[PDB]
Write an enzyme that holds these catalytic residues in place. Sequence first.
Site, short mmCIF file in Angstrom:
data_model
loop_
_atom_site.label_atom_id
_atom_site.label_comp_id
_atom_site.label_asym_id
_atom_site.label_seq_id
_atom_site.Cartn_x
_atom_site.Cartn_y
_atom_site.Cartn_z
CD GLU A 174 -8.58 -27.13 -16.03
OE1 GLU A 174 -8.77 -28.11 -16.77
OE2 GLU A 174 -9.34 -25.86 -16.14
CB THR A 177 -0.27 -23.24 -16.70
OG1 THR A 177 -1.01 -22.22 -16.38
CG2 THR A 177 0.54 -23.24 -17.94
CE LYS A 208 1.28 -30.03 -10.97
NZ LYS A 208 2.58 -29.39 -10.34
CG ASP A 235 -8.85 -25.26 -1.84
OD1 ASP A 235 -9.54 -24.44 -1.25
OD2 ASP A 235 -8.98 -25.88 -3.04
CG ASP A 295 1.55 -20.23 -7.85
OD1 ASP A 295 1.32 -18.79 -7.72
OD2 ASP A 295 0.76 -20.87 -8.72
CE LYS A 329 -2.37 -19.90 -7.22
NZ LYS A 329 -2.44 -20.82 -8.53
N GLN A 345 -5.79 -21.71 -2.66
CA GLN A 345 -5.93 -23.20 -3.19
C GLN A 345 -4.85 -24.16 -3.10
C1 LIG Z 1 -6.35 -26.24 -6.72
N1 LIG Z 1 -5.58 -27.21 -7.12
C2 LIG Z 1 -6.14 -28.42 -7.31
C3 LIG Z 1 -4.89 -29.68 -7.46
C4 LIG Z 1 -4.66 -29.51 -5.69
N2 LIG Z 1 -3.62 -30.54 -5.18
C5 LIG Z 1 -2.33 -30.36 -5.76
O1 LIG Z 1 -2.05 -29.67 -6.52
C6 LIG Z 1 -1.34 -31.30 -4.92
C7 LIG Z 1 0.25 -31.22 -5.64
N3 LIG Z 1 1.09 -31.39 -5.97
C8 LIG Z 1 -1.74 -32.26 -4.09
C9 LIG Z 1 -3.05 -32.21 -3.80
C10 LIG Z 1 -3.57 -33.01 -2.71
N4 LIG Z 1 -4.68 -33.15 -2.25
C11 LIG Z 1 -5.54 -32.34 -2.95
N5 LIG Z 1 -6.82 -32.14 -2.36
C12 LIG Z 1 -8.05 -31.45 -3.05
C13 LIG Z 1 -7.88 -30.09 -2.31
C14 LIG Z 1 -9.01 -29.22 -2.72
N6 LIG Z 1 -10.45 -29.82 -2.52
S1 LIG Z 1 -11.71 -28.80 -2.47
C15 LIG Z 1 -11.67 -27.78 -3.95
O2 LIG Z 1 -11.34 -28.01 -1.29
O3 LIG Z 1 -12.89 -29.67 -2.22
C16 LIG Z 1 -10.42 -31.29 -3.30
C17 LIG Z 1 -9.35 -32.10 -2.73
N7 LIG Z 1 -5.15 -31.30 -3.88
C18 LIG Z 1 -4.08 -31.27 -4.21
C19 LIG Z 1 -4.24 -28.15 -5.30
C20 LIG Z 1 -4.43 -27.15 -6.23
#
Ligand SMILES: CN1CCC(n2c(=O)c(C#N)cc3cnc(NC4CCN(S(C)(=O)=O)CC4)nc32)CC1
Length: 295
Positions: free
Chosen positions: A15, A17, A36, A83, A124, A126, A128
């Site tokens: 999630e 902003t 998203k 990540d 941005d 970072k 994650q």
């Molecule tokens: C923290 N936030 C969550 C949204 C995340 N995200 C996007 O924003 C995005 C776009 N556009 C595409 C993405 C594609 N794939 C994944 N896969 C997740 C990654 C982390 N993990 S985890 C905690 O390491 O187990 C679970 C699987 N995330 C994506 C990244 C930022």
Amino acid sequence: LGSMENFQKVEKIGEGTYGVVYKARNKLTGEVVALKKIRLVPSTAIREISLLKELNHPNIVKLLDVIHTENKLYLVFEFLHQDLKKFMDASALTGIPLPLIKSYLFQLLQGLAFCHSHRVLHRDLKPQNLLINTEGAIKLADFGLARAFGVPVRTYTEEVVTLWYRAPEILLGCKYYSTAVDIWSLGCIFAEMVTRRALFPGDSEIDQLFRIFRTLGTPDEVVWPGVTSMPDYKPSFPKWARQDFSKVVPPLDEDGRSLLSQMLHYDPNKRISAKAALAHPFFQDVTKPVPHLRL
Ligand SMILES: CN1CCC(n2c(=O)c(C#N)cc3cnc(NC4CCN(S(C)(=O)=O)CC4)nc32)CC1
């Protein structure tokens, strides 16, 4: 209406902003994707996003489709399982091995060199937003647009890491910042991989600025021409003296310290570009190891 019926949401994985992100399955095709959801599109955003759909590179999470339905805008992305934050946590007792740090840094500099050569900024970066897979790749995720849009998610929970990777020209009010902001962020992330602690973990904009200043020295016209005329610069900033990088990222070797120092130059015009960084001696012995991931 009905244009999303083709996606089964499997679990919520983010999630922001302004958006929420699900792991999802295309019910017709069976693909597993990241979805998203942005709640409402300025046409200016319509075209910034369209250009991102063409910004395809092995180290950029692929944008597969954009779908506008109801009060919602859906962006369909390639899905990765982990990540860099999670992997760094799982690796913290040992630390990520230096050859893997170097591979990840190299790949991200390649991705940045590519999107910077097309004048696209991430804005941005970072841990994650850096996604990894079992084959040793790391990819840039969730590019920031030059102007946000949509309805803020009311259930959004503050994240401590929000300011930790922000370049000093952004914190000082620069309106037209450059690709150098991404190089700063990536250098902060490089330091964190090496030391297993955030480099500049500020909890406010001024705390972030002052943490940078206490380590790198309060900038002045000598090292950063024009800094004293930046919109948010104040002559009353405390004057801290710089520390030695040897204290900042021990036990990193001189090649890595050298590269990091050039990624953290105050002056955006002195800060190393991604393309130049790829030629740095630090990468003379770069390889592509495969991490051990628990998925
Ligand atoms: C923290 N936030 C969550 C949204 C995340 N995200 C996007 O924003 C995005 C776009 N556009 C595409 C993405 C594609 N794939 C994944 N896969 C997740 C990654 C982390 N993990 S985890 C905690 O390491 O187990 C679970 C699987 N995330 C994506 C990244 C930022």
